[PDB]
From a paper:
In all these structures, mPPase is a symmetric homodimer, with each monomer consisting of 16 TMHs. Each monomer consists of four regions: a hydrolytic center, a coupling funnel, an ion gate, and an exit channel.
Here, we report the discovery and synthesis of the first nonphosphorus, non–substrate-analog inhibitor of TmPPase, N-[(2-amino-6-benzothiazolyl)methyl]-1H-indole-2-carboxamide (ATC), its preliminary structure-activity relationships (SARs), and a 3.4 to 4.0 Å resolution structure of ATC bound to TmPPase. Molecular replacement identified four TmPPase molecules (two dimers) in the asymmetric unit. In addition, at the gate of the TmPPase:IDP:ATC structure, Na+ is pentacoordinated by D2436.50, E2466.53, S2476.54, and D70316.46 (bidentate to both carboxylate oxygens). This is mostly because the sodium ion appears to be translated by about ~1.7 Å. In contrast, the RMSDs/Cα for the other loops that interact with ATC is smaller. The movement of chain A β1–2 due to the binding of the ATC dimer thus creates a hydrophobic clamp that locks the TmPPase exit channel in a closed state after substrate binding. ATC is thus an uncompetitive dimeric inhibitor with a clear preference for binding to the single-substrate bound form.
Residue numbers in the entry:
A (entry chain A): 2 to 726
B (entry chain B): 2 to 268, 275 to 345, 350 to 726
Write the structure that this text describes.
């Protein structure tokens, strides 16, 4: 029927991405030096991503075997499917960007205008965004059809108990495994690529600009190629992995709640269970988020096509915002129709959530979108150098490096507010509209047009690489100005994407707190009213202690990521100093440096440090539970949500502001002081201090939130009574 | 009987502090240049503290009148009493330090050893700590005797409702007003002094060391005198205010919970009135025993043979005070309390155990502080080493060190909460919150010891003395920074415990006389799955972060103003850098004073209003969520900022001791460490301390005012 037409949308999106790749590759590349630089960066990125993928997939096979042992095999199969999906999205994005960077560079060089370069960069971004959306929805639909339909886990959806004494719902456990695989692979990719790129960027920027007195991404700098390999590895593949994980997480949270609703909402009447809701309603609610995501992917495809066929403009932010708005409006309308018709007459919504009938979920979704948009706007206010905060930061740059650091930290901590209030209002409204199911539907709708968001976000790194390639090949300063404008727009878009991701994570984390309080129910007491089930008393000393511990664990995770970055940062700083002083004629320009040193340093550090964060995110719930019950784990989840949201928003805004103020000063817009002045060095120090907090901690925080919440939701059935205290 | 002997302890502490002040003043000060510099610094500190005190006391009178209007007059009277108590403790500490700085400096200069300077600095610190403890306990005992005994508010312990629809217990409301006044005055003092001193320090350090290439606190630097006046204003008066506020807040939380326990635990009252009265009076006797043990430890450490390692002497003081407190409080709990229905599961000794936790917790925190802040350990030394790689490296490694150190103390607090709960419910949780500050006198002493050493070093460097004097001052100042970090940890831990206890008291206060029968098991219930509660938690975390950011910005404004002023002076006054001209310290003094006085008001009003607005907007669950998020985020940020600022400052000092191989005071690593120290100053001396004050003030205001918007909410 129409379900098949909907389920074929992800394949159309993947085909569109492949077509965009074929079109960009058919574009003309640059000169011979441009080809050589692109080859260097592409080879580095390919090698590091190959090593990362091998390691991550070994770990993924191990985790899949464990999941198969301790739960149903369907869980392990879904885990592997999600791992493959996220890894493939990341690899596709990286393999597309490694080729589109030089294309954008050559376009901006020949045409001397922003239109063509913007168009090619948006083509690459669309490749990655369509790949992400299509992979996520394809994995989800394959799971829903094989383990939900072919095997019929969506038909029984009952509370079984496995051999290890674990209470589980079949389709619930399968989607949990799928989301866990997605999020764990995304965690590995993000941590690795972030460590790599941020160490390289810190070392190169700091040493070169502040000490050696070189231009940004100068060929004499033995770390520039490492920096660009990181831009392609950590800022692309990791970005796609994280965003696909967020999309799949919102959708799987909605689906898990819908599935768990059926066997719990029952009435015990003389030892006879009477289901308060018909199975058809739960099945409609389960299939609803998938159709929602498919309609959203279609609307994103429409907007991306309109923006890639439209006449190019000189203001790239205008084009990106036009794409986002068109996708969002198409999604709103088509999803209104989908919610009205699909949920027409179900007869069981009143019992759970929806108070305004079939349209109740749609409203929630709307909230999400709007919420996201709001955050987006706020991002552009705090990150863009065309507004008050970033400009005041750039001005304060005249007073000293310490002034820059303090003002950046204050700007981040202040910007923490408006988006948090947006999320508060969104939570309240989605609740009022359709309970926790609508909370999850809003989490999803905030990313309903995830394809366009991922596209507009990945657009940036391509422009950054184009600028790096133009600087390495000594191009016309007009090319550098085009790349700098595109890169500022890309920083704004990356801040917007981080905000979107963190908001979706918070919404899905509330929905998952609900599902986690649900999973604790055993078949023995499968009759108590959900009003008593969904209860996590905060006055229980265990819960508040767990909240404290979760906040501390989030902060320690961020600190460990920062330290893992700074280790390689210092190593490469020292290596660059050594090369500058021990290689004859390197600074004069008559000698070639050794980029391989920094490449290998960053690769080794990233490969060594990428493992611990994922394992922490996987184990923390299990250990905390087996030590102090399930209320402590609930408190830990609460504290994790709070601290992670706060730190992620703060770091995203602060890093965006710092980088855009550095770029604004580099454009000479700072009266009197140029690109080589002491204020520029202070802004460079600020940008290096913002780099690791913007490209590592922030993104990884939401992945940690979702991974930990999913692990707890899956494993609470055990430590609920197998605790030590 | 023996109760009068107990009620006389705070007066003895105040007398001991006055005697220590008279003894330090009887010591010989330095030369004419030292006398002139000390007089200038004392005049500046006195002037700024006078203005700050006048403004804060006008605001305090206004707030007391408002409290009298909307609640009982006893609340306003106790508010004024606590305001006066905290302001007096701070002013006494500051007036003692402004005179003890030059005395410590001259002692360390003449003796050429660390012993005499350490002894005099600890004398000043003991003056301030005894002042704080004595004033806090005297105000609290006067309230307990006048409104608790003379008027007998501890006799009825009923749930009344005032004309504005507020449910309250008489003595509960009175102690709430006292603690609220204490915390609001501490908030004003802390915010003002922190802005002042941190702006001055940022300006001076950055401009002088990074640009003009001058030594720390050089007379040519027109901000060194302003920086030291700030050290005396914000790091002394504010410190005493904050610590007295935490002490009184723990005790008042204990008292409020004890009072509210009676009329709620009914089936017929589940607990006899005598038991509730004994539990109400118990925290006061506990605090008195703790003050006595702190006095004993301070006396032993000021009479004990001086050592060359001052941290050893300070740790010996802390250990002796803590052990004396543990033993004497064990005896007090055994005899005075010579329960099962509420909390205590091990009989009369149940509360004492909890207190122990607190103490030990504090002690534990102490070690962790000394592990992360002292340059004699791995983290601070690694930071100093990373200083060779660049300023950005210093900043990133400092942030990482703070965020990691955030953990061990958090786990300590988690275990303490869990164990105190297991032992004696929320009453024992609050008693542990208090016991962590049981020896608050010794803690305040060891903490105020630091700023005195900082001022002595600044004065010795201003007069160009013997480098041995500067080395003595640097060692003492590093020890003082470590002790200040330990004190901040003490405050934040006590704040977390008391904030949980106040969450309990706030869930209790919502009970109205109409439904004064529901089982307490159902009353103490704040479901976290309520969308409103989680939204409020998110909003509270965001509000804490914005509070911190606004404080940082208030600091950076005056910091930039003074940086520009110093550059202008350097370029337009002939011979200033050459040394043939005299700078204008009054300019920086006035800049920082004006900025601090202007920015000093808003944070306290935010902390006071946020609960009221959030409540009248979204019921009581939203306010509960806001309190939870605020507590969590504030604890995290306070621990992080304290540890990070300590690490940065001690790494700078570790590089100053030459322990960094090859690089001296003028090398790029020293400039990077100075940039790190300037970035840490505002996060260490302004945000961190204000966070726990905000937590306590907001939770107390909520506990008092929830009775209105609990059902008079807009949604
Ligand atoms: N129009 C309608 S009535 C209706 C009823 C149900 C199932 N049980 C109930 O609501 C139910 C209400 C209630 C109140 C007190 C005690 C026990 C109770 N049990 C589900 C859908 C539906 N739709
Ligand atoms: N419209 C209506 S109210 C109503 C009430 C009753 C009798 N008690 C119940 O059903 C009932 C038991 C139970 C246990 C847990 C959660 C919810 C529950 N509900 C039966 C039918 C009916 N139909
Ligand atoms: K970027
Ligand atoms: K200090
Ligand atoms: Mg850079
Ligand atoms: Mg880059
Ligand atoms: Mg670049
Ligand atoms: Mg950038
Ligand atoms: Mg950068
Ligand atoms: Mg300083
Ligand atoms: Mg000082
Ligand atoms: Mg000083
Ligand atoms: Mg100091
Ligand atoms: Mg300082
Ligand atoms: Na995410
Ligand atoms: Na405090």
């Amino acid at each position: 029927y129409v379900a098949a037409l909907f389920f074929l949308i992800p394949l159309v999106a993947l085909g569109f991405a492949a077509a965009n790749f074929a079109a960009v590759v058919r574009k003309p590349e640059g000169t011979e030096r441009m080809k050589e630089i692109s080859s260097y960066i592409r080879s580095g990125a390919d090698s590091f991503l190959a090593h990362e993928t091998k390691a991550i997939f070994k770990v993924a096979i191990v985790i899949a075997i464990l999941l198969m042992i301790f739960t149903t095999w369907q869980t392990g199969v879904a885990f592997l499917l999600g791992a493959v999906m996220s890894a493939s999205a990341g690899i596709v994005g990286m393999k597309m960007a490694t080729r589109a960077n030089v294309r954008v560079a050559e376009a901006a060089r020949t045409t001397k205008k922003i239109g063509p370069a913007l168009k090619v960069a948006y083509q690459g971004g669309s490749v990655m965004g369509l790949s992400v959306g299509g992979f996520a929805l394809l994995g989800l639909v394959l799971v829903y059809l094989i383990f939900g339909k072919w095997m019929g886990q969506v038909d029984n959806l009952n509370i079984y108990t496995n051999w290890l004494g674990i209470n589980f719902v079949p389709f619930a456990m399968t989607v949990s495994g799928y989301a866990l695989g997605c999020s764990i692979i995304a965690m590995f990719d993000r941590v690795g690529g972030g460590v790599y790129t941020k160490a390289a960027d810190m070392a190169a920027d700091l040493v070169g600009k502040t000490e050696l007195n070189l231009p940004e991404d100068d060929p004499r700098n033995p770390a520039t190629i490492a920096d660009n390999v990181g831009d392609n590895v950590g800022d692309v593949a990791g970005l796609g992995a994280d965003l696909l994980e967020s999309f799949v997480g919102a959708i799987v949270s909605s689906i898990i709640l819908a599935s768990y609703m059926f066997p719990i909402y029952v009435q015990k009447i003389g030892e006879n269970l009477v289901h308060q809701v018909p199975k058809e309603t739960i099945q409609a609610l389960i299939s609803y988020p998938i159709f929602f995501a498919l309609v959203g992917l279609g609307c994103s495809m429409l907007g991306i096509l309109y923006v890639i066929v439209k006449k190019p403009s000189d203001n790239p932010q205008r084009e990106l915002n036009i794409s986002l708005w068109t996708s969002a409006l198409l999604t709103v309308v088509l999803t209104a129709f989908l919610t009205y018709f699909y949920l027409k007459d179900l007869q069981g919504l009143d019992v759970l959530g929806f108070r305004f009938g079939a349209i109740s979920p749609w409203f929630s979704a709307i909230i999400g979108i709007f919420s996201g948009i709001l955050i987006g706007f706020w991002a552009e206010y705090y990150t863009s150098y065309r507004y008050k905060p970033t400009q005041f930061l750039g001005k304060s740059s005249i007073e000293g490096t310490g002034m820059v650091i303090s003002n950046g930290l204050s700007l981040g901590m202040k910007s923490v507010f408006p988006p948090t209030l947006t999320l508060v209002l969104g939570i309240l409204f989605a609740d009022y509209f359709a309970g926790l199911y609508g909370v999850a539907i809003a989490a999803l709708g905030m990313l309903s047009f995830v394809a366009t968001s991922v596209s507009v976000d990945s657009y940036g790194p391509i422009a950054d690489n184009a600028g790096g390639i133009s600087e390495m090949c000594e191009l016309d300063p007009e090319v550098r100005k085009i790349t700098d404008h595109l890169d500022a727009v890309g920083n704004t878009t990356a801040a917007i994407g981080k905000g979107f991701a963190i908001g979706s994570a918070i919404f899905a984390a509330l929905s998952l707190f609900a599902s986690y309080m649900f999973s604790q129910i055993s078949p023995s007491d499968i009759g108590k009213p959900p009003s008593l089930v969904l209860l996590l008393n905060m006055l229980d000393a265990r819960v508040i202690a767990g909240a404290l511990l979760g906040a501390a664990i989030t902060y320690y995770f961020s600190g460990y990521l920062i330290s893992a970055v700074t280790k390689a940062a210092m190593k490469m700083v020292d290596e660059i100093r050594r090369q500058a002083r021990e290689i004859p004629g390197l600074l004069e320009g008559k000698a070639k440096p050794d980029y391989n040193r920094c490449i290998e340093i960053t690769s080794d550090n990233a490969l060594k440090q990428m493992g611990y964060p994922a394992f922490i995110a996987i184990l923390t719930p299990l250990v905390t539970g087996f030590l102090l019950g399930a209320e402590f784990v609930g408190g830990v989840l609460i504290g994790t949500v709070l601290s992670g949201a706060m730190l992620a928003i703060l770091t995203a805004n602060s890093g965006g502001a710092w980088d855009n103020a550095k770029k604004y000063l580099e454009a000479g817009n700072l009266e009197g002081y140029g690109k080589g002045s002491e204020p520029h060095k202070a802004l460079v120090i600020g940008d290096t201090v913002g780099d690791p907090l913007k490209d590592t901690v922030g993104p990884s925080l939401d992945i940690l939130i979702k991974i930990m919440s999913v692990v707890s939701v899956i494993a609470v059935s055990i430590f609920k009574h197998v605790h030590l205290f």
